[PDB]
């Protein structure tokens, strides 16, 4: 399937014990999709003071599209040093490994895969 339907619990910045994916664009796409797949990731809310808590590069989760059945369609976009490798909407969260953190809500979403 081109998508699936996901449910992603989202975390508080402070409680995240593994921070960010890996260290190249292109490690952090692979791991986050990896993790997408396997139930183990976890969405941060972007506010004030959160990103540079996380680790660079960043994977976004971004709407790509505007709601099939609760779930918003979004896609992946990473950044790094203020440079984005994909162009989409408006941002979700920063996604993150999931490693059994206890969540403050969940976000349904539609991933294009």
């Known amino acids: 399937k081109t998508h699936v ?7 508080q910045v402070r409680d995240v014990l593994v921070r960010g994916f890996g260290d190249s664009v292109e490690e952090v796409l692979s ?4 993790h997408l797949k396997d139930g183990t990731c976890g969405l941060v809310e972007v506010e004030k003071g959160v990103l540079p808590q996380l680790e660079q590069p960043y994977v976004f ?5 505007a ?7 979004v896609e992946l976009v990473a950044e790094l040093e203020g440079i984005q490798y994909g162009r989409s909407g408006e941002t979700l969260g920063v996604l993150v ?11 349904k979403v539609l991933l294009r895969k």
């Open 5 to 11: 339907q996901l449910s992603l619990p989202v975390l």
């Open 31 to 34: 791991e986050a999709r990896q």
């Open 61 to 65: 989760i971004k709407r790509s599209d």
């Open 67 to 73: 709601a099939p059945h609760g779930h918003v369609m």
């Open 97 to 107: 490994p999931h490693v059994g953190e206890i969540p403050v809500a969940y976000r």
